PDB file of C-alpha atoms (C1' of nucleotides) in Angstrom:
ATOM      1  CA  UNK A 261     -30.201 135.922 153.094  1.00  0.00           C
ATOM      2  CA  UNK A 262     -31.861 139.347 152.674  1.00  0.00           C
ATOM      3  CA  UNK A 263     -30.741 142.952 152.345  1.00  0.00           C
ATOM      4  CA  UNK A 264     -29.947 144.985 155.454  1.00  0.00           C
ATOM      5  CA  UNK A 265     -31.016 148.481 156.506  1.00  0.00           C
ATOM      6  CA  UNK A 266     -28.602 151.315 157.287  1.00  0.00           C
ATOM      7  CA  UNK A 267     -28.924 153.830 160.122  1.00  0.00           C
ATOM      8  CA  UNK A 268     -26.506 156.750 160.420  1.00  0.00           C
ATOM      9  CA  UNK A 269     -25.997 158.818 163.568  1.00  0.00           C
ATOM     10  CA  UNK A 270     -26.747 162.224 162.034  1.00  0.00           C
ATOM     11  CA  UNK A 271     -30.294 161.491 160.847  1.00  0.00           C
ATOM     12  CA  UNK A 272     -31.152 157.937 162.017  1.00  0.00           C
ATOM     13  CA  UNK A 273     -31.931 157.135 158.373  1.00  0.00           C
ATOM     14  CA  UNK A 274     -30.447 154.815 155.785  1.00  0.00           C
ATOM     15  CA  UNK A 275     -30.847 152.850 152.576  1.00  0.00           C
ATOM     16  CA  UNK A 276     -30.824 149.125 151.747  1.00  0.00           C
ATOM     17  CA  UNK A 277     -27.775 147.397 150.313  1.00  0.00           C
ATOM     18  CA  UNK A 278     -26.505 143.948 149.330  1.00  0.00           C
ATOM     19  CA  UNK A 279     -23.305 142.645 150.881  1.00  0.00           C
ATOM     20  CA  UNK A 280     -20.749 140.995 148.632  1.00  0.00           C
ATOM     21  CA  UNK A 281     -21.029 137.641 150.402  1.00  0.00           C
ATOM     22  CA  UNK A 282     -24.449 136.915 148.873  1.00  0.00           C
ATOM     23  CA  UNK A 283     -23.122 137.571 145.366  1.00  0.00           C
ATOM     24  CA  UNK A 284     -20.021 135.498 146.112  1.00  0.00           C
ATOM     25  CA  UNK A 285     -22.132 132.537 147.250  1.00  0.00           C
ATOM     26  CA  UNK A 286     -24.442 132.802 144.235  1.00  0.00           C
ATOM     27  CA  UNK A 287     -21.480 132.939 141.840  1.00  0.00           C
ATOM     28  CA  UNK A 288     -19.896 129.946 143.588  1.00  0.00           C
ATOM     29  CA  UNK A 289     -23.093 127.909 143.228  1.00  0.00           C
ATOM     30  CA  UNK A 290     -23.575 128.840 139.568  1.00  0.00           C
ATOM     31  CA  UNK A 291     -19.937 128.090 138.718  1.00  0.00           C
ATOM     32  CA  UNK A 292     -20.196 124.728 140.480  1.00  0.00           C
ATOM     33  CA  UNK A 293     -23.268 123.796 138.443  1.00  0.00           C
ATOM     34  CA  UNK A 294     -21.638 124.968 135.200  1.00  0.00           C
ATOM     35  CA  UNK A 295     -18.453 122.988 135.844  1.00  0.00           C
ATOM     36  CA  UNK A 296     -20.480 119.889 136.718  1.00  0.00           C
ATOM     37  CA  UNK A 297     -22.499 120.102 133.508  1.00  0.00           C
ATOM     38  CA  UNK A 298     -19.354 120.783 131.442  1.00  0.00           C
ATOM     39  CA  UNK A 299     -17.419 117.870 133.029  1.00  0.00           C
ATOM     40  CA  UNK A 300     -14.673 120.171 134.277  1.00  0.00           C
ATOM     41  CA  UNK A 301     -13.949 121.858 130.933  1.00  0.00           C
ATOM     42  CA  UNK A 302     -15.927 124.946 129.872  1.00  0.00           C
ATOM     43  CA  UNK A 303     -14.394 126.504 126.739  1.00  0.00           C
ATOM     44  CA  UNK A 304     -10.821 125.825 127.824  1.00  0.00           C
ATOM     45  CA  UNK A 305     -11.316 126.829 131.481  1.00  0.00           C
ATOM     46  CA  UNK A 306     -10.333 123.520 133.061  1.00  0.00           C
ATOM     47  CA  UNK A 307     -10.782 123.368 136.829  1.00  0.00           C
ATOM     48  CA  UNK A 308     -10.537 121.079 139.859  1.00  0.00           C
ATOM     49  CA  UNK A 309     -13.324 120.557 142.426  1.00  0.00           C
TER      50      UNK A 309
ATOM     51  C1'   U B 202     -22.212 148.809 154.348  1.00  0.00           C
ATOM     52  C1'   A B 203     -19.791 143.202 153.819  1.00  0.00           C
ATOM     53  C1'   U B 204     -14.599 140.060 154.734  1.00  0.00           C
ATOM     54  C1'   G B 205     -13.139 135.269 151.519  1.00  0.00           C
ATOM     55  C1'   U B 206     -11.466 127.416 151.405  1.00  0.00           C
ATOM     56  C1'   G B 207     -18.912 126.176 153.568  1.00  0.00           C
ATOM     57  C1'   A B 208     -25.838 130.585 153.129  1.00  0.00           C
ATOM     58  C1'   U B 209     -31.823 124.182 150.592  1.00  0.00           C
ATOM     59  C1'   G B 210     -34.812 130.782 154.228  1.00  0.00           C
ATOM     60  C1'   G B 211     -38.385 129.692 146.779  1.00  0.00           C
ATOM     61  C1'   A B 212     -37.368 126.348 153.900  1.00  0.00           C
ATOM     62  C1'   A B 213     -43.827 128.565 156.150  1.00  0.00           C
ATOM     63  C1'   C B 214     -51.629 129.926 152.488  1.00  0.00           C
ATOM     64  C1'   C B 215     -53.139 134.977 157.920  1.00  0.00           C
ATOM     65  C1'   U B 216     -55.286 130.443 157.868  1.00  0.00           C
ATOM     66  C1'   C B 217     -59.938 128.490 160.706  1.00  0.00           C
ATOM     67  C1'   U B 218     -65.437 129.487 162.803  1.00  0.00           C
ATOM     68  C1'   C B 219     -70.541 133.111 161.988  1.00  0.00           C
ATOM     69  C1'   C B 220     -78.584 133.829 157.393  1.00  0.00           C
ATOM     70  C1'   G B 221     -77.426 142.168 157.180  1.00  0.00           C
ATOM     71  C1'   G B 222     -81.447 139.331 160.553  1.00  0.00           C
ATOM     72  C1'   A B 223     -85.732 141.430 163.649  1.00  0.00           C
ATOM     73  C1'   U B 224     -90.704 144.957 164.634  1.00  0.00           C
ATOM     74  C1'   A B 225     -94.264 148.518 161.737  1.00  0.00           C
ATOM     75  C1'   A B 226    -101.935 148.298 157.486  1.00  0.00           C
ATOM     76  C1'   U B 227     -99.160 154.864 153.135  1.00  0.00           C
ATOM     77  C1'   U B 228    -102.835 155.830 156.538  1.00  0.00           C
ATOM     78  C1'   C B 229    -106.397 160.485 158.048  1.00  0.00           C
ATOM     79  C1'   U B 230    -111.838 165.877 161.360  1.00  0.00           C
ATOM     80  C1'   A B 231    -111.869 169.997 165.341  1.00  0.00           C
ATOM     81  C1'   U B 232    -110.687 174.629 165.202  1.00  0.00           C
ATOM     82  C1'   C B 233    -106.845 178.222 164.730  1.00  0.00           C
ATOM     83  C1'   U B 234    -105.538 183.068 166.940  1.00  0.00           C
ATOM     84  C1'   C B 235    -104.676 187.224 172.369  1.00  0.00           C
ATOM     85  C1'   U B 236    -105.236 192.133 174.256  1.00  0.00           C
ATOM     86  C1'   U B 237    -110.525 194.838 175.073  1.00  0.00           C
ATOM     87  C1'   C B 238    -110.777 200.016 177.722  1.00  0.00           C
ATOM     88  C1'   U B 239    -114.081 202.925 182.341  1.00  0.00           C
ATOM     89  C1'   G B 240    -119.204 201.746 178.791  1.00  0.00           C
TER      90        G B 240
END
RNA sequence: UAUGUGAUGGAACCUCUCCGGAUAAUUCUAUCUCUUCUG
């Protein structure tokens, strides 16, 4: 659940980054909580579980 | 630099144990210095 470290061949150096899966999971969790608290209707955005 | 119908990692105290201690009167007398030229 943390950021990874890059390592290229040319210099054996890199920079940290965040994969999209972490953001996807966080958005899924937040949307689930929002839909639960809105009883499946948040400003006209009706949804199924 | 992921690959997608599924990530409680905020899901974990560098914590625990150990006398900066021990010994000492702010006291007091013998020289110092080497080359002199027949004596």
